[PDB]
Amino acid sequence: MLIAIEGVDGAGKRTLVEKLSGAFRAAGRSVATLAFPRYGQSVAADIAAEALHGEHGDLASSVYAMATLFALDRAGAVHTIQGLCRGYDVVILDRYVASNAAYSAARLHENAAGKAAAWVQRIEFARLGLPKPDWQVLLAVSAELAGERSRGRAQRDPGRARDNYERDAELQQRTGAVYAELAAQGWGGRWLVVGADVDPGRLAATLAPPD
Amino acid sequence: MLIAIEGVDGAGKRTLVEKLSGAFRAAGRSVATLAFPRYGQSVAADIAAEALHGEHGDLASSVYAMATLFALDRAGAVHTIQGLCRGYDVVILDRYVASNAAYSAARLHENAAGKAAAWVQRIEFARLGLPKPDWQVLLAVSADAELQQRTGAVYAELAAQGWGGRWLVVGADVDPGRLAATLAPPD
Ligand SMILES: Cc1cn(C2CCN(Cc3cccc(Oc4ccccc4)n3)CC2)c(=O)[nH]c1=O
Ligand SMILES: Cc1cn(C2CCN(Cc3cccc(Oc4ccccc4)n3)CC2)c(=O)[nH]c1=O
Ligand SMILES: [Cl-]
Ligand SMILES: [Cl-]
Ligand SMILES: [Cl-]
Ligand SMILES: [Cl-]
Ligand SMILES: [Cl-]
Ligand SMILES: [Cl-]
Ligand SMILES: [Cl-]
């Protein structure tokens, strides 16, 4: 079973990955986890990170160029995703294809029914052959909490160096709304929308009901 | 020996590559050639091709995004270039890193000493470790028009300045035997 955890930066995605991992293992299921982008393991992801911190000229301002880099990074991980799914009962991804649909649409002021989200689905699922997740779990938290926890688009920089607090906060709002539309329409498969305090045992039971 | 053929007239480059290949082989040297971008053989190059035909949203309007795809195409080709050099006396590349410097600078209205050409050198040679060629041969006299003119002028300064290594600047009708003898002089 392949599960993707989705949401805006600062939602607490990794915390959920860990507690869900613990709940599955308590129920006798083996679990492996993987986070995107895969820094150090593709040129594409490293260039994207550098672009977010101001390198590479006008690269980051092209929404489709950044999205292409994140897709190429995932394409490089297909054998890992498939190998983990062979060796483990449950594979949990921190961010996956829907991240690309949500942020790209939001950067372009589009909704989930728009061109960017359709382009993401075509290029990643159809053209590059990424496996579809069995579940996509949207971790939806308050805009305020996400704003305080997010490190912004330049996540290497110390907090004292953030100066785009407004652009990033507006983008996160739009991205949250696209995510919600993605979940409502079953984009790429089944979705569940959960909060920060979701019980891990009961969440694991819902995602993989016992036989 | 690793040789890159450069210029704005690609139909002329291809003829030059063929005539040069024959001259090397006539001199007892085995030759392999490889063309960039590797259209039909890498996703990065194919996405770039599609972007030039209007696909992929705003991608083609970013000079650095397109340049990045061509760099990723070459980054994926390191073992091919290196393996060819290990298996053949002469490896001739039809377009190489300097193509990225010249076209990117020209699209941005910069010259050979500007930011884009420096960025190309830093990312492709210093960071991704593409092999430095023994020769870059600029085809400068052949047998968007303004963009082509600007690309030609950047090319000429790149060669004059030794960008990325040694350059030779030639016309199309240069004697292939002498050109082959110049690039890999017989013993
Ligand atoms: C794995 C993944 C991730 N992302 C983004 C997730 C958020 N992260 C940090 C962030 C936090 C706040 C604002 C912001 O603005 C962006 C987002 C995308 C591109 C450029 C700027 N970016 C950048 C990559 C994406 O766009 N597509 C993906 O496929
Ligand atoms: C191998 C290589 C090649 N090129 C270009 C060579 C010319 N080719 C076709 C062409 C012919 C005439 C104008 C033009 O303008 C461009 C160039 C780059 C990007 C967009 C448009 N493009 C596009 C790729 C490049 O920019 N970087 C490279 O690394
Ligand atoms: Cl998070
Ligand atoms: Cl386990
Ligand atoms: Cl980073
Ligand atoms: Cl840079
Ligand atoms: Cl933006
Ligand atoms: Cl060699
Ligand atoms: Cl001549």
Instruction: Please tell me the experimental approach by which this structure was elucidated.
Output: X-ray
Q: Give the integer Cα–Cα distance in Å for B93 and B125.
A: 16
A181 annotated ligand-binding residue: no
* Type of residue found at A136: Q
Nearest CA to ligand 1 atom 23: A153
Considering only CA atoms, which of A205, A198, A194, A210 is closest in space to residue A4? A194
CB crowding A160-181: b at 16 or more within 10 Å, else e: eeeeeeeebeebbebbbebbbb
Q: Please, which residues have CB within 8 angstroms of residue B120's CB and are 6 or more apart in sequence?
A: B67, B71, B97, B100, B101, B104
The residue written with tokens 């010259």 in the block is: B111
Dihedral (C-alpha) B138, A55, A68, A157: value to the nearest 10 degrees? 160
CB crowding A6-26: b at 16 or more within 10 Å, else e: bbbbbbbbeebbebbbebbee
| A54-59: Cβ within 8 A, 24+ apart | A54/A154, A56/B64, A56/B68, A56/B119, A56/B123, A57/B62, A57/B63, A57/B64, A57/B115, A57/B116, A57/B119, A58/B62, A58/B63, A58/B64, A58/B65, A59/B62, A59/B64, A59/B65, A59/B68
Considering only CA atoms, which of A193, A203, A199 is closest in space to residue A7? A193
Q: Give the integer Cα–Cα distance in Å for B117 and B106.
A: 10
Enter the DSSP assignment of B32.
E
**Structural resolution in Å:** 2.2
A7 annotated ligand-binding residue: yes
DSSP three-state, residue B113: coil
DSSP three-state, residue B88: coil
Q: Rounded to 5, what percent of chain A is helix, strand, coil?
A: 55, 10, 35
Q: Give the integer Cα–Cα distance in Å for B72 and A47.
A: 10
Q: Give the integer Cα–Cα distance in Å for B93 and B136.
A: 9
Nearest CA to ligand 2 atom 16: B103
Nearest-neighbour CA in chain A from B41: distance (Å): 14
Kind and range of the H or E run holding A206: helix A200-207
The residue written with tokens 């990045």 in the block is: B68
Kind and range of the H or E run holding A196: none
CA distances to A48, A63, A70 from A39, in Å = 9, 20, 11
Tell whether A63 is within 8 A of chain B (Cβ).
yes
Q: Give the integer Cα–Cα distance in Å for B57 and A71.
A: 15
Alpha helices in chain B (DSSP H): 10-26, 43-52, 63-75, 78-87, 97-107, 115-120, 145-160, 176-183
Q: How many CB atoms lie within 10 A of CB A199?
A: 12
Q: Give the integer Cα–Cα distance in Å for A99 and A95.
A: 6
CA distances to A56, A154, A192, A197 from A52, in Å = 9, 6, 30, 31
Report residue A74 as tokens.
Answer: 């995932």
Q: Which residues line ligand 1 (CB under 6 A)?
A: A 9, 36-37, 52, 60, 66, 70, 95, 99-100, 103, 150, 152-153, 168, 171
A47–B62: do the CB atoms touch at under 8 Å?
no
Q: Parallel, antiparallel, or unpaired: how do β-strands A2-6 and A135-139 relate?
A: parallel
Considering only CA atoms, which of A125, A114, A109, A128 is closest in space to residue A4? A125
Report residue B88 as tokens.
Answer: 């053949």
Alpha helices in A3-162 (DSSP H): 13-26, 43-52, 63-75, 78-87, 97-107, 115-121, 143-149
CA distances to A96, A137, A184, B19, B57 from B84, in Å = 37, 48, 53, 20, 36
Chain B stretch 16-55, residues whose beta carbon is closer than 8 A to a beta carbon of chain A: 43-44, 47
A9 annotated ligand-binding residue: yes
- Please give the residue range of the domain that contains residue A51: 1-211
**Cβ distance B141 to B159 under 8 Å?**
no
Number of domains in chain B: 1
Nearest-neighbour CA in chain B from A68: distance (Å): 9
A61–B63: do the CB atoms touch at under 8 Å?
no
Show the CA angle centred on residue B73, arms to residues B67 and B78, nearest 5°: 125
Dihedral (C-alpha) A168, A170, A175, A180: value to the nearest 10 degrees? 150
Enter the DSSP assignment of A132.
P
B70: CATH = 3.40.50.300
Strand partners, B136: B4, B167
Tell whether B63 is within 8 A of chain A (Cβ).
yes
